[PDB]
């Protein structure tokens, strides 16, 4: 059965640190993948989407993020210079002419410097 | 010979509000590359389908090469050729794991050089030739596409020609001079919300070739 594995599941980083979240399809070869972040027990907000390899599409909340789809199975979310404000739980999803498959979530804490 | 670009002819990168990554990535480390191979199927009458494994990332087992017209398809069907292309996947369809490109095909037999040849690229930034460098090929007759790719690849690594969000350069074109005759391509994306990889790359479907010995390359960039 088709699934999605995010990595890591929990991360802490310093302001200014480069952070990369991974998302890997298992037992599927789907064209669409998605990166959302969830605010505080509420709605998922889309940062980026991808309609396939070598495609990234802006979502509602793309500022301060980048992303990358170098192959079907893999859609990564890049925080170039992490901000405390990017502290959140992040969710990956793959999607396939009907269904969606969601990852377990990555809790990311971005702390302040000295 | 082709006229040089008139003032407002060139695409302005400030007028493109999508993600430049979608252009950047066409000129990243990866590209379609095959040596001495023969078409093994055809979808539409102006394409040919080659059997090429993406050994690196596993992204494709076959490649659709699309042409401007039937004649080009007919010309190279059944021929043993070398393929070199900037490829796309999103709106790529043809009747496993697939990818699509345009042109990028040269005859194999008789086109091979004994040594690699150097072609000089001169890069003008707001009219000042502040950087020059060489690209290399081993083909006697090489496609413009391959040369273009090699040129933009360097410029991405070394001048951040394209980034994820936008580009430091407002306008850009690449000029190919071959003796008297010359032509150019717009290096920036069409203006609008999203970038259309398929449409942009379609410019290469003329399969235009040049002579590696006597072609020179000029690249004109302007800042914001
Ligand atoms: Cl909204
Ligand atoms: Cl929207
Ligand atoms: Cl776009
Ligand atoms: Zn809302
Ligand atoms: Zn879309």
Swiss-Prot record, chain B:
Gene Ontology CC annotations of this record: extracellular region
Keyword Metal-binding tagged: yes
UniProt keyword list: Disulfide bond, Enterotoxin, Metal-binding, Secreted, Signal, Superantigen, Toxin, Virulence
InterPro entries: Enterotoxin, Staph/Strept_toxin_CS, Staph_tox_OB, SuperAg_toxin_C, Superantigen_bac, Toxin_b-grasp_Staph/Strep, Toxin_bac
MF term (GO), any: toxin activity
Miscellaneous remark of the record: Lacks the zinc-binding site found in other members of this family, such as staphylococcal enterotoxin A, C2 and D, thus it possesses only one MHC class II binding site.
Subunit structure of this chain's protein: Interacts with MHC class II molecules composed of alpha/HLA-DRA and beta/HLA-DRB1 chains. Interacts with T-cell receptor beta variable 19/TRBV19.
Protein name: Enterotoxin type B
Provenance organism: Staphylococcus aureus
């Amino acid at each position: 059965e088709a699934a999605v594995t995010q990595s890591p599941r929990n991360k802490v980083a310093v302001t200014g640190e480069k952070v990369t979240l991974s998302c890997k399809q298992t037992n599927s070869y789907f064209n669409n993948m998605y990166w959302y972040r969830q605010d505080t027990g509420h709605e998922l907000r889309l940062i980026f989407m991808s309609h396939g390899i070598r495609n990234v599409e802006k979502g509602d909340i793309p500022d301060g993020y980048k992303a990358s789809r170098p192959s079907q199975e893999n859609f990564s979310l890049i925080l170039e210079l992490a901000t405390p404000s990017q502290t959140s739980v992040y969710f990956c999803a793959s999607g396939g002419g009907g269904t969606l498959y969601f990852g377990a979530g990555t809790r990311l804490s971005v702390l302040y410097g000295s | 010979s082709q006229p040089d670009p008139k003032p407002d002819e060139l695409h302005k990168s400030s007028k493109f509000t999508g993600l430049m990554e979608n252009m950047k990535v066409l000129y990243d480390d990866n590209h379609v590359s095959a040596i001495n191979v023969k078409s093994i199927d055809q979808f539409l009458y102006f394409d040919l389908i080659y059997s090429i494994k993406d050994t690196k990332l596993g992204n494709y087992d076959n490649v659709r090469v699309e042409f401007k017209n039937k004649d080009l398809a007919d010309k190279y069907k059944d021929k043993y050729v070398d393929v070199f292309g900037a490829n796309y996947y999103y709106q790529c369809y043809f009747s496993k794991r697939k990818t699509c490109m345009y042109g990028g095909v040269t005859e194999h037999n008789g086109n091979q050089l004994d040594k690699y040849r150097s072609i000089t690229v001169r890069v003008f930034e707001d009219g000042k030739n502040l950087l020059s460098f060489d690209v290399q090929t081993n083909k006697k007759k090489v496609t413009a596409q391959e040369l273009d790719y090699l040129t933009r690849h360097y410029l991405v690594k070394n001048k951040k020609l394209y980034e994820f969000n936008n580009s430091p350069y407002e306008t850009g074109y690449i000029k190919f001079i071959e003796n008297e005759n010359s032509f150019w391509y717009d290096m920036m994306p069409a203006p609008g919300d999203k970038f259309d990889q398929s449409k942009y790359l379609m410019m290469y479907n003329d399969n235009k070739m040049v002579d590696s010995k006597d072609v020179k390359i000029e690249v004109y960039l302007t800042t914001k």
